[PDB]
Amino acid sequence: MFEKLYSAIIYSDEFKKILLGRGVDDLEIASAYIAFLYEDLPIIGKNLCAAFLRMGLDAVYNVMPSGKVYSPRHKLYPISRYGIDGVCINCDGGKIILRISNKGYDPEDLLESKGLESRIFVSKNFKKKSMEIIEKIWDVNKIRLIARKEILERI
Numbered sequence: 001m002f003e004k005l006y007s008a009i010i011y012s013d014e015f016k017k018i019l020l021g022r023g024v025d026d027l028e029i030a031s032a033y034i035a036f037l038y039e040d041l042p043i044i045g046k047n048l049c050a051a052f053l054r055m056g057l058d059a060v061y062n063v064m065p066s067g068k069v070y071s072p073r074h075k076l077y078p079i080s081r082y083g084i085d086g087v088c089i090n091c092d093g094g095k096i097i098l099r100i101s102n103k104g105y106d107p108e109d110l111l112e113s114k115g116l117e118s119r120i121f122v123s124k125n126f127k128k129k130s131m132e133i134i135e136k137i138w139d140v141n142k143i144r145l146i147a148r149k150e151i152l153e154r155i
Contacts, residue, residue, distance in 0.1 A: 006134050007143070008032050008053035014147040015060060016048060018155070020067050024049055026100060026126040027090050028067075033110050033130075034087055034098065034120070041116075042075040042086025044094055051076050060154050087120065100124055107133070 009032055013023045025046070032049035034041065043050045051059040051069035054076065062071040068078030077084055080093030088094025097119055104121035105113065107130050123129070134140055 002036075004053060005032060005036050006138060007147075008049055009130060009134060010138075010140060010143050011057070011147045011151070012049040012052040012059070014144050015052070015063075015151050016067055018148070018151060019063065024127065026122070026124070027098070029127045029130050030098060030110075030122045031089050033107060033122075037111065037113070038087075038116065040075070041096075042077060042084050043089065044077045044080060044084065044086055045089035045091045047076050047078070047089060057150060057154055060151060096120060098122065100126070 009029060012028065016022065016024050027046040028049050031043050031047045032053050035043055035050035035053045045068065047069050048063065048067055051062065051071065051074070054074040055062065055071060059069060062069045064070055064078045066078060069076045070078050075086065080088065080091065085095045087096040087098055089098050095118065096116060099121055101121040102124060104123040106123045107126060110122060
């Protein structure tokens with residue numbers, strides 16, 4: 001059920017390393033979990049992992065210099081914008097605001113929440129926990145190599 005989520009995280013991590021020289025961060029990873037739960041919710045702010053979930057490899061065409069994605073058709077926006085509302089990733093410009101906190105959801109518990117509150121809190125080490133799970137189940141080095149090759153053919 002979750003293959004698209006794991007692949008979005010690996011592909012976005014490899015793409016960000018190619019473009020900006022660093023991997024995706026905790027909030028960017030959390031955006032893919034939110035996008036996995038709410039297909040119709042605009043995601044505003046740190047959203048690269050959500051973009052690979054919604055757009056696949058086509059996400060590479062819509063990345064801003066900041067590493068955030070602009071794609072109205074997929075309800076992805078890099079900054080607060082007139083006429084859009086949704087979840088603002090670690091920003092105040094939204095009717096739902098997502099932040100990191102000590103008592104925030106771990107990845108698995110986030111995916112089990114039934115209900116969209118106005119304030120979403122995710123645990124610290126969100127990336128670490130997501131990445132530990134994926135390396136446990138998949139041959140991540142092999143997938144990373146395929147992802148890099150496929151990304152570079154589009155770039």
